[PDB]
Coordinates of C-alpha atoms and ligand atoms in Angstrom, one line a residue:
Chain A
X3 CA 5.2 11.8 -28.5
X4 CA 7.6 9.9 -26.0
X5 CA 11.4 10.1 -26.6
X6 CA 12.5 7.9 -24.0
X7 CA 12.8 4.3 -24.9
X8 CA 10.9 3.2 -21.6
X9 CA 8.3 0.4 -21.0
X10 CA 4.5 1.4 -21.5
X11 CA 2.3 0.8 -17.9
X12 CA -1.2 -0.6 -18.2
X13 CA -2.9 -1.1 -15.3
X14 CA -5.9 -3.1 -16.7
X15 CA -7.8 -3.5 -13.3
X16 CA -11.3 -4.7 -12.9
X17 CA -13.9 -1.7 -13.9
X18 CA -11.2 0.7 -15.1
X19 CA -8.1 0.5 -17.1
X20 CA -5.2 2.8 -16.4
X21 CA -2.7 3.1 -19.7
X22 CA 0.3 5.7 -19.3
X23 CA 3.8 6.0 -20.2
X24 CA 6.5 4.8 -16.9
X25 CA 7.7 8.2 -15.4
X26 CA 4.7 9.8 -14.9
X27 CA 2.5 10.0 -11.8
X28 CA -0.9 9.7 -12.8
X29 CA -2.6 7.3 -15.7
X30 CA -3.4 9.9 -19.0
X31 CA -5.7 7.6 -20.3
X32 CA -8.7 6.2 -17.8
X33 CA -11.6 4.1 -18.9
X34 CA -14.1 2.3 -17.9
X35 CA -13.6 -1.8 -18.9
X36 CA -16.6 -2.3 -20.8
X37 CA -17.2 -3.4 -24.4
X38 CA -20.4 -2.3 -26.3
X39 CA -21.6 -4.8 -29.1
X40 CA -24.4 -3.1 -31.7
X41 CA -27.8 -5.1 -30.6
X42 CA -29.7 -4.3 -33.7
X43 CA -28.8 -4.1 -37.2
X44 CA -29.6 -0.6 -39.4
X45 CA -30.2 0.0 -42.8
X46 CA -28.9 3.1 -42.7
X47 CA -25.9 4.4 -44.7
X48 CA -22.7 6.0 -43.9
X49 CA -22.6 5.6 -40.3
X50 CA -19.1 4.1 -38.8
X51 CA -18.8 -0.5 -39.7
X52 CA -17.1 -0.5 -36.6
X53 CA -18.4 -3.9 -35.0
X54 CA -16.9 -3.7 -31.2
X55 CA -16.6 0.0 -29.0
X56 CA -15.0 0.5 -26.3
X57 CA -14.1 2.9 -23.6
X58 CA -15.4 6.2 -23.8
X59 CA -16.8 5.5 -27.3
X60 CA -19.3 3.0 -25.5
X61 CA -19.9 5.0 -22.7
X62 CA -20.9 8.2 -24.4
X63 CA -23.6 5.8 -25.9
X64 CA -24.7 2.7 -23.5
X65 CA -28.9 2.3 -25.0
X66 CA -27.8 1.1 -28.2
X67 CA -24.8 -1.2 -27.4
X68 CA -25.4 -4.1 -24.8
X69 CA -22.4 -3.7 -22.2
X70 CA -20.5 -6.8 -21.8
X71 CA -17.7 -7.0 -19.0
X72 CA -14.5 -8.6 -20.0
X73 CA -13.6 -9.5 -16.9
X74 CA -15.9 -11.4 -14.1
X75 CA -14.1 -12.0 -10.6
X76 CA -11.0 -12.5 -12.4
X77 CA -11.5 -15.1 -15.0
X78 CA -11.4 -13.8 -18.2
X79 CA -14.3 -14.2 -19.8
X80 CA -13.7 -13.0 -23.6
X81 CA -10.3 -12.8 -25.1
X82 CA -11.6 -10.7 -28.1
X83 CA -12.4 -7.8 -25.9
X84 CA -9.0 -8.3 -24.4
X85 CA -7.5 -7.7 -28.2
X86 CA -10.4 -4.9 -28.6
X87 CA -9.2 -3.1 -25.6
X88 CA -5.2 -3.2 -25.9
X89 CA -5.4 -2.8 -30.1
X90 CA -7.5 0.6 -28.7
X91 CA -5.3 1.5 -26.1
X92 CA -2.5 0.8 -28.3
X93 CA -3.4 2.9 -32.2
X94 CA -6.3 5.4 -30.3
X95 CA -5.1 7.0 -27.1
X96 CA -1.3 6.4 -26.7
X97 CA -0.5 6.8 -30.4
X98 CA 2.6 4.4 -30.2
X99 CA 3.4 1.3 -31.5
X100 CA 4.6 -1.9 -28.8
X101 CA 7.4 -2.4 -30.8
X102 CA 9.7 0.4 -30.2
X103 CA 8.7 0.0 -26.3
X104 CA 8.2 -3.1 -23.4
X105 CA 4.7 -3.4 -21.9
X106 CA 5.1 -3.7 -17.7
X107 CA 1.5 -4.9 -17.0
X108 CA -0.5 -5.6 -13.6
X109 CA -2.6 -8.8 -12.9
X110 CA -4.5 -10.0 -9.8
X111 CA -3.1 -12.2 -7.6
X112 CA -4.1 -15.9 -7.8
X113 CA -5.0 -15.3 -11.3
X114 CA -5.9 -18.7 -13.6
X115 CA -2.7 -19.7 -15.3
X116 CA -5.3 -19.3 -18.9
X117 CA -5.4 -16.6 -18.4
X118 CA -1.7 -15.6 -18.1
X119 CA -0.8 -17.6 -20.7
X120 CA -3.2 -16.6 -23.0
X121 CA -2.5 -12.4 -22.5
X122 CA 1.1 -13.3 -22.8
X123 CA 0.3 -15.2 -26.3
X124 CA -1.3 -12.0 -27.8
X125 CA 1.5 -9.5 -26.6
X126 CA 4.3 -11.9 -27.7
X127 CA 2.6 -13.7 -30.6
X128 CA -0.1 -11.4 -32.4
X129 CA 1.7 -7.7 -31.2
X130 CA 5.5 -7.4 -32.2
X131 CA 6.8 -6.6 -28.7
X132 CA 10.2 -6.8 -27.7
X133 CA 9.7 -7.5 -23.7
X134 CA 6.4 -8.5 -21.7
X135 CA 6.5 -9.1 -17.9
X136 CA 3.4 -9.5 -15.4
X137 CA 3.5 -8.6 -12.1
X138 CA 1.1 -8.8 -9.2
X139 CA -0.6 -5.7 -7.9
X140 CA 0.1 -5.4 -4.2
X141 CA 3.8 -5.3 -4.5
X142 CA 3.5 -2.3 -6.6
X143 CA 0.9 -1.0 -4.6
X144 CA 3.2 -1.6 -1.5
X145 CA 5.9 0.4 -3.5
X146 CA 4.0 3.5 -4.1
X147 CA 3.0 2.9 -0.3
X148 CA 6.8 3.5 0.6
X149 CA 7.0 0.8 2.7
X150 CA 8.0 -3.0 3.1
X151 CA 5.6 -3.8 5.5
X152 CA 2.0 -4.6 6.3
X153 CA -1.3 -6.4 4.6
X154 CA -2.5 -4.7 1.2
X155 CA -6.5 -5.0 1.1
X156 CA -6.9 -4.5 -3.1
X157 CA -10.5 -4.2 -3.7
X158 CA -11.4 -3.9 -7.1
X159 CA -14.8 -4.2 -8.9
X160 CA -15.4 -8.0 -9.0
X161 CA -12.8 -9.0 -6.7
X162 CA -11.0 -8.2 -3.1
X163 CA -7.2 -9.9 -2.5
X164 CA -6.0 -9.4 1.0
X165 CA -2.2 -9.8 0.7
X166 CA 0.3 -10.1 3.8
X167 CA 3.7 -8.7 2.9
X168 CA 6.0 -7.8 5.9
X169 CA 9.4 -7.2 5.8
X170 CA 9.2 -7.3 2.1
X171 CA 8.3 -10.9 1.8
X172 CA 5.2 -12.0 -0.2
X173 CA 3.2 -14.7 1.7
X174 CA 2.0 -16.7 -1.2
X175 CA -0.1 -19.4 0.8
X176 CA -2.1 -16.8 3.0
X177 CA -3.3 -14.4 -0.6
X178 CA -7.0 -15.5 -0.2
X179 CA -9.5 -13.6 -3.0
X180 CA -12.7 -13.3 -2.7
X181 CA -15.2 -12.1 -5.1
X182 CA -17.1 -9.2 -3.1
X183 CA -16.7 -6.1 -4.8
X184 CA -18.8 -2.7 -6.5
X185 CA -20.6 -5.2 -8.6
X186 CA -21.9 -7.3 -5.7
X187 CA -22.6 -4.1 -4.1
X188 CA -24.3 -2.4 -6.8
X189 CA -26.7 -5.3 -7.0
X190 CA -27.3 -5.1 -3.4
X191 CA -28.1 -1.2 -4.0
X192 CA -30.0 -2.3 -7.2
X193 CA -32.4 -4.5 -5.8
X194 CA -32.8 -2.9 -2.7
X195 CA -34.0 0.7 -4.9
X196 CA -36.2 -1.9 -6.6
X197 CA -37.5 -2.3 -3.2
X198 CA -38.2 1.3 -2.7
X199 CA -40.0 1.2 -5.6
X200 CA -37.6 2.4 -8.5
X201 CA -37.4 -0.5 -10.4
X202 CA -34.9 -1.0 -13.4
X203 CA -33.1 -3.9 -15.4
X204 CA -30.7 -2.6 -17.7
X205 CA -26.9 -2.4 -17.5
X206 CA -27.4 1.7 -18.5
X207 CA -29.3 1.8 -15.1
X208 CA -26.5 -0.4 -13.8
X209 CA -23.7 2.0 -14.5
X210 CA -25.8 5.3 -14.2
X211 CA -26.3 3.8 -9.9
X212 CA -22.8 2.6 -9.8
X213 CA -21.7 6.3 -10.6
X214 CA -24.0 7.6 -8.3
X215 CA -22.8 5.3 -5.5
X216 CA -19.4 6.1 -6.0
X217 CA -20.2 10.1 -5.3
X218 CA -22.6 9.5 -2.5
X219 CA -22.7 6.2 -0.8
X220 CA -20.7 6.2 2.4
X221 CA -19.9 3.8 5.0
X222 CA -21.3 4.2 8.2
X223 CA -19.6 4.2 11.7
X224 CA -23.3 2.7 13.8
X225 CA -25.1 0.5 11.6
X226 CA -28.1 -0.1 14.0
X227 CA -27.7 3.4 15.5
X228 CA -28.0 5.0 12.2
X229 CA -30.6 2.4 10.9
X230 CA -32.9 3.6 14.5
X231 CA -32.3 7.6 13.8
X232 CA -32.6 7.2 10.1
X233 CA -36.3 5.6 11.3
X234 CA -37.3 9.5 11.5
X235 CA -35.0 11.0 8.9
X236 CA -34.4 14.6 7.8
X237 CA -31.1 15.6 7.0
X238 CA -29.9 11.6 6.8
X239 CA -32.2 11.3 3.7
X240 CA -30.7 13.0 0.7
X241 CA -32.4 14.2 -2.5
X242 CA -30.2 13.3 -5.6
X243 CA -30.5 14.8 -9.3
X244 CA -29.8 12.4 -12.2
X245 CA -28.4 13.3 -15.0
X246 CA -31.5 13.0 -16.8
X247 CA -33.3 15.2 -14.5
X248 CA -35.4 13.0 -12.7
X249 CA -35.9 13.3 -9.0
X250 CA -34.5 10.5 -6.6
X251 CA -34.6 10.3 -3.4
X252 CA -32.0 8.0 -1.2
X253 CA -31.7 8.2 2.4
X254 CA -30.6 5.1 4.6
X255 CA -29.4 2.6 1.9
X256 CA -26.0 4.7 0.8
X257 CA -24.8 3.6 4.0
X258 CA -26.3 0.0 4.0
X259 CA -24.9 -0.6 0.8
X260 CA -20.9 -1.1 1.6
X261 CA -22.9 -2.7 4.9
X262 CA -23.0 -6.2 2.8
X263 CA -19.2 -6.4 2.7
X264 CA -19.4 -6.7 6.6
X265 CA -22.3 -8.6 6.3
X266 CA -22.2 -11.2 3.0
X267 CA -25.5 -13.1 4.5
X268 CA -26.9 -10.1 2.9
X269 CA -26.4 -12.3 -0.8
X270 CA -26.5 -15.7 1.1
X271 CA -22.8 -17.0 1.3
X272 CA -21.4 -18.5 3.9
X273 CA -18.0 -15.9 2.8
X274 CA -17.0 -14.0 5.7
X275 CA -17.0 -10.5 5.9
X276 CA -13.5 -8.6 4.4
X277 CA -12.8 -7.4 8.0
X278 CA -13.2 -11.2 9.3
X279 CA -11.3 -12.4 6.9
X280 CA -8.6 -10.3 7.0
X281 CA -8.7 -10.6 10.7
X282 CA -8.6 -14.7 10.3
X283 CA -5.4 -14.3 7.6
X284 CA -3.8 -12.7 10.2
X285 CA -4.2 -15.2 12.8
X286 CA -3.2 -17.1 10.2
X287 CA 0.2 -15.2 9.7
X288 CA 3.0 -15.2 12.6
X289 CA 2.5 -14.5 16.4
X290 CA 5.5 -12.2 16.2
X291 CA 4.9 -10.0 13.1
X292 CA 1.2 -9.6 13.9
X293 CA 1.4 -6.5 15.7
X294 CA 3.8 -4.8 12.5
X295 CA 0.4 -6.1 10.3
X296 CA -1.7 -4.1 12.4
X297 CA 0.8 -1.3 12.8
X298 CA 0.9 -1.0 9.0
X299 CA -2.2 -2.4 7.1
X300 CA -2.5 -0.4 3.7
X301 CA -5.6 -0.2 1.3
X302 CA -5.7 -0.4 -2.8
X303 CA -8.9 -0.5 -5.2
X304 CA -11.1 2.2 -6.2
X305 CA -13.8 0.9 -4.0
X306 CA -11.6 2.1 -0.9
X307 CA -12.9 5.9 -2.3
X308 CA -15.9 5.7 0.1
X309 CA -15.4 8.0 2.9
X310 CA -15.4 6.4 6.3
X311 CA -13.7 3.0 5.8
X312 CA -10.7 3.7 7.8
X313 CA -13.1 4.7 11.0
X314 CA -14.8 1.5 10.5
X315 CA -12.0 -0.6 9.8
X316 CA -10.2 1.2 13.0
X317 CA -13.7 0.2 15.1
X318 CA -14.1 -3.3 14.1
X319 CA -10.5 -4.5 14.5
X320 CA -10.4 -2.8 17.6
X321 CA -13.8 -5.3 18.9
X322 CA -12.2 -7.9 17.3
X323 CA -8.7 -8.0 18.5
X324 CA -7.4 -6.8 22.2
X325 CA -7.4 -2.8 22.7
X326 CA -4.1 -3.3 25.0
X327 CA -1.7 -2.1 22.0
X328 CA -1.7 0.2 18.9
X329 CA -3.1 -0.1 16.0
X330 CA -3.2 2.8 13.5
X331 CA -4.7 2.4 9.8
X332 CA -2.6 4.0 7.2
X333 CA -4.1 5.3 4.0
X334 CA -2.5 6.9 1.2
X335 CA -3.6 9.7 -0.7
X336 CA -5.0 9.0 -4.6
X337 CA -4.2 5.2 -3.2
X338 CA -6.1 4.0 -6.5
X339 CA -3.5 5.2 -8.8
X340 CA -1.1 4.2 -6.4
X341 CA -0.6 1.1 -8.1
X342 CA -0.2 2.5 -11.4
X343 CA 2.2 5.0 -9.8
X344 CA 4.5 1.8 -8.3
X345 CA 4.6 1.1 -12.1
X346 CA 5.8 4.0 -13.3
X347 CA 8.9 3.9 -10.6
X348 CA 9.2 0.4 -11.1
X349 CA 9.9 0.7 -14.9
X350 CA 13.1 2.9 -14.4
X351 CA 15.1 1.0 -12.5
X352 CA 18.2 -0.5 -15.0
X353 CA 17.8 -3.7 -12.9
X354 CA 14.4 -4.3 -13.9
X355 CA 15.5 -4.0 -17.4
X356 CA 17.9 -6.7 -17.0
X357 CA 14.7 -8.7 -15.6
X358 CA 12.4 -8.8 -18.8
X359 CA 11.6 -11.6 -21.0
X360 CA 12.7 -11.4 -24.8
X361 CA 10.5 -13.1 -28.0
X362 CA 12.9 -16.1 -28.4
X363 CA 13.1 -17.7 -25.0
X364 CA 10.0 -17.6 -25.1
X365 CA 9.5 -19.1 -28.3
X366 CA 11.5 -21.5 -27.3
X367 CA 10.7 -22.5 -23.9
X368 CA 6.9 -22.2 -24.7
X369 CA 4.5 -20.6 -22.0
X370 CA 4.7 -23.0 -19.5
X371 CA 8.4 -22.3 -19.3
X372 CA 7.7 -18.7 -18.5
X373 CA 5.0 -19.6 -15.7
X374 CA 7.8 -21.4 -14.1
X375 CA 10.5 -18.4 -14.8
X376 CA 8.1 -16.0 -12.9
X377 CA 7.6 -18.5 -10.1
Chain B
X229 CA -54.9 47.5 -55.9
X230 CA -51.9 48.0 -56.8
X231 CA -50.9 51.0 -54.5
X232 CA -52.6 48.2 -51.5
X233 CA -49.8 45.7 -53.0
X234 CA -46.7 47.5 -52.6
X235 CA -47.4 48.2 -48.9
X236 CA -48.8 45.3 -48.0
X237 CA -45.5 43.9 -50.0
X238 CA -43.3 46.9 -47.5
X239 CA -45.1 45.4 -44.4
X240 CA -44.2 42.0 -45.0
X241 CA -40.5 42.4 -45.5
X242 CA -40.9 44.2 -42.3
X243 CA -42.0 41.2 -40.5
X244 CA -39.4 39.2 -42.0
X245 CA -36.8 41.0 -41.3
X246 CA -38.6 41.2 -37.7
X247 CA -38.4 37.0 -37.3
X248 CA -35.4 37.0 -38.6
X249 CA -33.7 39.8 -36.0
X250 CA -35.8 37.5 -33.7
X251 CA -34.4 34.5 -34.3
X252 CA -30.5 35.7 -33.9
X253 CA -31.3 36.7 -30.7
X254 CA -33.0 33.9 -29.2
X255 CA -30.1 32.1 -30.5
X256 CA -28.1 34.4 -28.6
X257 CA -29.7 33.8 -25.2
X258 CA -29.8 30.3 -25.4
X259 CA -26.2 30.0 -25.9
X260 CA -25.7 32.2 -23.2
X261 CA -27.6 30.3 -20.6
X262 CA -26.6 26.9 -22.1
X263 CA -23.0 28.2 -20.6
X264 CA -23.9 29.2 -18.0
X265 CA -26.1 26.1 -17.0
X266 CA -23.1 24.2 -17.9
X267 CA -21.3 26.2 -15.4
X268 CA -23.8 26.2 -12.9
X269 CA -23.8 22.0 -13.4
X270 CA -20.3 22.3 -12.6
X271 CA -20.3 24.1 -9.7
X272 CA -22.7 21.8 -8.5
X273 CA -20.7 18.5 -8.8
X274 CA -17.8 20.2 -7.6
X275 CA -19.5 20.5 -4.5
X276 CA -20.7 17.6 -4.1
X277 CA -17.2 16.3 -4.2
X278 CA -16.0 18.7 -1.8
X279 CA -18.8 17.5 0.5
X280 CA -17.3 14.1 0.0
X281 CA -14.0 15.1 0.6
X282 CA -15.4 16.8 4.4
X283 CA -17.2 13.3 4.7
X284 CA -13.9 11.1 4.4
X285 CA -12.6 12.7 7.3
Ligands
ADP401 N1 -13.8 7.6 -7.7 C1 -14.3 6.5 -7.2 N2 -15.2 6.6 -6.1 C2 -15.8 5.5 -5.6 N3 -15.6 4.2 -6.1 C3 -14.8 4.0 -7.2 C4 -14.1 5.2 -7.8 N4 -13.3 4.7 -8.8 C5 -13.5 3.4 -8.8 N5 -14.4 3.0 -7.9 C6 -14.8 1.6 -7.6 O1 -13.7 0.7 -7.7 C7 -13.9 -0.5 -8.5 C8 -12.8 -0.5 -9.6 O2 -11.6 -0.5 -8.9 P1 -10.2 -0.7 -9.7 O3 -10.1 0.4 -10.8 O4 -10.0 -2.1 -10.1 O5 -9.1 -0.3 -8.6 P2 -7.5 -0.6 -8.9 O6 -7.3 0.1 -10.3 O7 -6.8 0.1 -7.8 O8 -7.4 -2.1 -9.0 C9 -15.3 -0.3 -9.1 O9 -16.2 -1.2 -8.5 C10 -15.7 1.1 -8.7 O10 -17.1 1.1 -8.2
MG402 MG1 -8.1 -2.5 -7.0

C-alpha cells in the first residue's frame, strides 16, 4: 500500500487517535480512544473470542462493553489498551508492518517519564521497529501553524497545556497543564441535564452528550446577558433529536457548559480559569516579547471546535490586559489535525532522519539514557 | 364436493399468489423510504453543521 520507506505518524491524543502515513495532510484513520471489555459472559456459540475492542468496533456497540479510557489527564492508566490499540492500528487499518517503517509519535507535554519509558519499551522491545522518536505536540502544532512565534493553547479531552514558544524557543519552565478538558465539561453538562430532570449514569449516555455537545454547544460572548434574556427564551432554547428518537430539549446550558473553563469554581478547585492562567504565564514570560505573545497566540485540541472562542478569548484578554495596543487572535483552519499535519512535514525532512534512535543504542544505553538524549 | 374443492383449491392459490405479490412490494417501499430517510437524516446533519459553521463566525 505505501512505496515510500517513510516513518508512520500517530497522533494518539486524548479522546481521539490520528494514525496516517507522513506526506499526507489529513489522518486516514480517526478513532475514538476507548477500549470496550465484554461485561457478561455468553453461552452462545460462534460469535467472535475476541476479549478487548477497540475503536470503531466498540463504538458501533457501547451497551454491551463497559468503556474504559486509557488515558486519564495524561497518566497512563492501562498499558494493555496501549498494546490493544497500536497492535489494531498497526494489523487492522494501516495494513503494514513497523518493521519496514519508523513510528514519529506525539505525546503531551510534561508527560510522566513511566510513561515514556514504558511506550518506548513496547515499540522497541515487543514490536520490531527500526527507529522510535517522541516529540511534544505544540512544536508540531506550531509547525503546521507556519510560524515561530506565540503561545500554543492545546486542549485536549482530559488535559489543556499552554505552551510559550517565541522566536522558536520552547520555554520549558513556564508549560503549566492543567486537567480541564471535554471530560470535565461533559460532566458539568451531565449533571447539570440531571438537573433538568434527564437523568442518566452510563458511559453510552456519556458519549451519546459528549457528541451532541461537540455539534451544538457553543461559547457565549455575555454570560450574565445571555443567562437574563435566556430567562424568557424562544429562539435561545433549541430542540434536539437523538439518535434514538427521543425528544430533548436544551436551551441555556450549551453555552454554560464551556462557561466552567472560565469559571472552575464551577467543580470546586481553586485552578484558575484557562484565560487566567494563560494570562498569568504570560506575565510570567518576558516584558519584551509579551506583546509578540499576544500578537501571535495560536490554539490546538479538538475542544477549540466550539464556535465563539476566539470572540471570547479576544474580550477577556482585552479586560484583562491594557486596550492601548494590538492584539489579534490567530486561528487556523482544521487546527485539530494541525498537529498531525506538522507530523507529516516533519517526517520528510533528511535531517530528521539523521535524528532518530536505532534498537542498539538503545539497548545499550537502557531508557534512562534516551530520556537524557531527548533532553 | 368435489367440484366445491377444486375452486375453493383455485381461490386459494389466488390469495397466495395475492400475499405473495403483496409482500414484494411492501418490500419494495420500505427500501425506498429507508433511502430516502437516510438521505433525509443526512441532509439534516449537514445542516446542522453548516449552522455551526455560520455560528463560528
Ligand atoms: N469536531 C469536534 N467538535 C467539537 N469538539 C471536538 C471535536 N473533535 C474533538 N473534540 C473534543 O476535543 C477533545 C479531544 O481532542 P484531541 O483529539 O485530543 O485534540 P488533538 O488531537 O488536537 O490533541 C474531546 O474532549 C472532544 O470533546
Ligand atoms: Mg489537543
Amino acid at each position: 500500500d505505501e512505496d515510500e520507506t517513510t516513518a508512520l505518524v500517530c497522533d494518539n491524543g486524548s479522546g481521539l487517535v490520528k494514525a496516517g502515513f507522513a506526506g499526507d495532510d489529513a489522518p486516514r484513520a480517526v478513532f475514538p480512544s476507548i477500549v470496550g471489555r465484554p461485561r457478561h459472559q455468553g453461552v452462545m456459540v460462534g460469535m467472535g473470542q475476541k476479549d478487548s475492542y477497540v475503536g470503531d468496533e466498540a463504538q458501533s456497540k457501547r451497551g454491551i462493553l463497559t468503556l474504559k479510557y486509557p488515558i486519564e489527564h495524561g497518566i497512563i492508566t492501562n498499558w494493555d489498551d496501549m498494546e490493544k490499540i497500536w497492535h489494531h492500528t498497526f494489523y487492522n487499518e494501516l495494513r503494514v508492518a513497523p518493521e519496514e517503517h519508523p513510528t514519529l509519535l506525539t505525546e503531551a507535554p510534561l508527560n510522566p517519564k513511566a510513561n515514556r519509558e514504558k511506550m518506548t519499551q513496547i515499540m522497541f522491545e515487543t514490536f520490531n521497529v527500526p527507529a522510535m522518536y517522541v516529540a511534544i505536540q505544540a512544536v508540531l502544532s506550531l509547525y503546521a501553524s507556519g510560524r515561530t512565534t506565540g503561545i500554543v493553547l492545546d486542549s485536549g479531552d482530559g488535559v489543556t497545556h499552554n505552551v510559550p514558544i517565541y522566536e522558536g524557543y520552547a520555554l520549558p519552565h513556564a508549560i503549566m497543564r492543567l486537567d480541564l478538558a471535554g471530560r470535565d465539561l461533559t460532566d458539568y453538562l451531565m449533571k447539570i441535564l440531571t438537573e433538568r430532570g434527564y437523568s442518566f449514569v452510563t458511559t453510552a449516555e456519556r458519549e451519546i452528550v459528549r457528541d451532541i455537545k461537540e455539534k451544538l454547544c457553543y461559547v457565549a460572548l455575555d454570560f450574565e446577558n445571555e443567562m437574563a434574556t435566556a430567562a424568557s427564551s424562544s429562539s435561545l432554547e433549541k430542540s434536539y433529536e437523538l439518535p434514538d428518537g427521543q425528544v430533548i430539549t436544551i436551551g441555556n446550558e450549551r453555552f454554560r457548559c464551556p462557561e466552567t473553563l472560565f469559571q472552575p469554581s464551577f467543580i470546586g478547585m481553586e485552578s484558575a480559569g484557562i484565560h487566567e492562567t494563560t494570562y498569568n504565564s504570560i506575565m510570567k514570560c518576558d516584558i519584551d516579547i509579551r506583546k509578540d505573545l499576544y500578537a501571535n497566540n495560536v490554539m490546538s485540541g479538538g475542544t477549540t471546535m466550539y464556535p465563539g472562542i476566539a470572540d471570547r478569548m479576544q474580550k477577556e484578554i482585552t479586560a484583562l490586559a491594557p486596550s492601548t495596543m494590538k492584539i489579534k487572535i490567530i486561528a487556523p483552519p482544521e487546527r485539530k489535525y494541525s498537529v498531525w499535519i506538522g507530523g507529516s512535514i516533519l517526517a520528510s525532512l533528511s535531517t530528521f532522519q539523521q535524528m532518530w534512535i536505532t534498537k542498539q543504542e538503545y539497548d545499550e544505553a537502557g531508557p534512562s539514557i534516551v530520556h537524557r538524549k531527548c533532553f | 364436493l368435489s367440484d366445491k374443492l377444486k375452486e375453493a383449491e383455485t381461490r386459494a392459490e389466488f390469495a397466495e399468489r395475492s400475499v405473495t405479490k403483496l409482500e414484494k412490494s411492501i418490500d419494495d417501499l420500505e427500501d425506498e423510504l429507508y433511502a430516502q430517510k437516510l438521505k433525509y437524516k443526512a441532509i439534516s446533519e449537514e445542516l446542522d453543521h453548516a449552522l455551526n459553521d455560520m455560528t463560528s463566525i
